[PDB]
């Protein structure tokens, strides 16, 4: 029935609202110009990053990293820091997808281990336009041009994310669309090392129906939006592997030692 599916959508949308403070609708308002006053600090070069570093830390010692370092490395350390933060919120949201917490604990951990990245890059798209990305819970805004100009390995780092966001943001999805999408990702029965594949696919199967009904109702004028959205999941799988490859060059060719015990061991045997 339709009402069951719609009830599952409403249910997901409210968890997602509990789990993620900066939503797409809020982020989009900020990126445009809703009630222009609390404007984010715009970082567009090195000087304005240093000037900004002391306006998201000059308050009271809470940045995404301290100093005594090269700027291209510090930006990258701040991003790994935020990712660990975002893994916690994704885990919290997962627990509220019906059926998830009744899976075998190891399969829970595996699902999260490979889902988290695709979700991070999906949701990061809500903070981006073609020119930059909202940072620090929407406090800052770092321009795509500035990220591009960092040195050889750090420059080409966030570009692929921006290439994705633009094509994905053109689907015009909202938070209620994304909440299901995100849940269809977590319950991917094709992750390596999964013990019980059948029950996961039973869940995804019921989320797919929910997604499909959601898109058909919320976006009737968009022929085959469901299909296009499932195809975007190849693009995500792609950006993850390509990010994974770039990440396995950073720890390989660099001088900075300071990586999070969580990601560095969760990146282990990962595509």
Closest CA to 142 of 43, 242, 252: 43
Cβ proximity of 187 and 200 under 8 Å? yes
Looking at residues 117 to 176 of the shown chain, list those that interact with ligand SP0 (rule: CB under 6 A).
Answer: 120, 124, 147, 150, 154, 157-158, 161
Rounded Cα distance between 241 and 237, Å, is: 6
Specify the pairing of strand 41-43 against strand 140-143: parallel
Rounded-to-integer distance, Cα 104 and Cα 51, Å: 49
Q: Is 117 annotated to bind ligand?
A: yes
| 88 binding partner (options its own copies, ligand SP0, none; Cβ < 5 to 8 Å by kind) | its own copies
Residues between 9 and 68 with contacts to ligand SP0, criterion CB under 6 A:
none
Q: How far is the CB of 14 from ligand SP0 (least distance, A)?
A: 23
178 binds, among ligand SP0, its own copies, none (CB under 5 to 8 A by kind): none
Report how far apart, in Å, the C-alpha atoms of 179 and of each of 16, 48, 212 are. 6, 35, 13
142: part of which helix (H) or strand (E)?
strand 140-143
- Per CB under 8 A, residues contacting its own copies are 11, 14, 17-18, 60-62, 64-66, 81, 84-85, 88, 91-92, 95-96, 98, 101-102, 104-106, 108-109, 195-196, 261-262
Query: Rounded to whole angstroms, how far apart are CA atoms 38 and 83?
Result: 25
By beta-carbon proximity to its own copies, the closer residue of 20 and 162 is 20
Residues lying near ligand SP0 in the complex (CB under 6 A)? 75-76, 79-80, 82-83, 86, 120, 124, 147, 150, 154, 157-158, 161, 259, 263
Q: From the annotation, which residues make up the binding site for rosiglitazone?
A: 80-83, 117, 243, 267
Q: From the annotation, which residues make up the binding site?
A: 80-83, 117, 243, 267
């Amino acid at each position: 029935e339709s009402a069951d599916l719609r009830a599952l959508a409403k249910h997901l949308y409210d968890s997602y609202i509990k789990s993620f403070p900066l939503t797409k609708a809020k982020a989009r308002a900020i990126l445009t110009g809703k009630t222009t006053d609390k404007s984010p600090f715009v970082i567009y070069d090195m000087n304005s990053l240093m000037m900004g570093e002391d306006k998201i830390k000059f308050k009271h010692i809470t940045p995404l990293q301290e100093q005594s370092k090269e700027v291209a490395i510090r930006i990258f350390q701040g991003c790994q820091f935020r990712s660990v933060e975002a893994v916690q919120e994704i885990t919290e949201y997962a627990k509220s997808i019906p059926g998830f917490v009744n899976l075998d604990l190891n399969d829970q951990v595996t699902l999260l281990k490979y889902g988290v990245h695709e979700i991070i890059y999906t949701m990061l798209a809500s903070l981006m336009n073609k020119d930059g990305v909202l940072i620090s819970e929407g406090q800052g805004f770092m321009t795509r041009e500035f990220l591009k100009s960092l040195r050889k390995p750090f420059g080409d780092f966030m570009e692929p994310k921006f290439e994705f966001a633009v094509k994905f943001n053109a689907l015009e999805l909202d938070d209620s669309d994304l909440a299901i999408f995100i849940a269809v990702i977590i319950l991917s029965g094709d992750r390596p090392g999964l013990l019980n594949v059948k029950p996961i696919e039973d869940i995804q199967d019921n989320l797919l129906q929910a997604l499909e009904l959601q898109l058909k109702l919320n976006h009737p004028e968009s022929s085959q939006l469901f299909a296009k959205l499932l195809q975007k999941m190849t693009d995500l799988r792609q950006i993850v592997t390509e990010h994974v490859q770039l990440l396995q060059v950073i720890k390989k060719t660099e001088t900075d030692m300071s990586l999070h015990p969580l990601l560095q061991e969760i990146y282990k045997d990962l595509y």
